[PDB]
């Protein structure tokens, strides 16, 4: 599917919180922790849910844990989209 952007994660977050602007904080909140901008987790949990379903991402369930900033979630998503789904692996020990 299509990767993700800051404007995306922001709006979906905005919809979750119920704000009237994808980026109400202003803009200087791309590298600020969710708790540092005003997000708790419950809202993020919902937003992340819509993303995993809307984008169909699934690199790691713990991605939400490490995800402290928006660039994190977006990174995990963009990484999933760019990854183009997994494939187990393919070591080199045959012919």
């Amino acid at each position: 599917m299509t990767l993700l952007t800051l404007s995306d994660l922001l709006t979906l977050l905005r919809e979750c919180a119920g704000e009237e602007e994808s980026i109400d904080l202003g803009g200087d909140v791309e590298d600020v922790a969710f708790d540092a901008l005003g997000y708790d987790s419950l809202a993020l949990l919902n937003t992340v849910g819509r993303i995993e379903r809307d984008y169909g991402v699934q690199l790691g369930d713990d991605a939400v844990e490490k995800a402290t900033t928006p660039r994190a979630l977006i990174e995990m998503t963009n990484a999933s989209l760019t990854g183009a789904s997994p494939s187990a692996g393919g070591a080199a020990r045959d012919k």
Side-chain angles (χ1 to χ4, degrees):
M1 288 207 135
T2 47
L3 71 158
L4 206 138
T5 41
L6 314 185
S7 268
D8 289 329
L9 180 85
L10 289 153
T11 309
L12 42 104
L13 255 178
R14 178 228 112 197
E15 316 239 50
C16 193
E19 282 289 304
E20 199 203 48
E21 188 168 299
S22 303
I23 294 72
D24 196 54
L25 321 331
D28 204 43
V29 63
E30 63 221 62
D31 280 287
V32 186
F34 294 117
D35 190 85
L37 72 88
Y39 286 131
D40 276 61
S41 217
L42 57 92
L44 271 165
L45 167 51
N46 298 303
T47 6
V48 185
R50 197 146 164 191
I51 305 149
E52 59 168 43
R53 201 143 145 282
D54 284 44
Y55 290 76
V57 299
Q58 192 191 315
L59 309 178
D61 296 316
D62 54 277
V64 298
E65 203 187 40
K66 306 195 85 209
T68 178
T69 13
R71 296 271 195 177
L73 307 169
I74 302 170
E75 271 171 72
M76 291 280 178
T77 323
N78 281 255
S80 84
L81 283 320
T82 180
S85 270
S87 273
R93 54 146 153 169
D94 64 81
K95 194 209 283 195

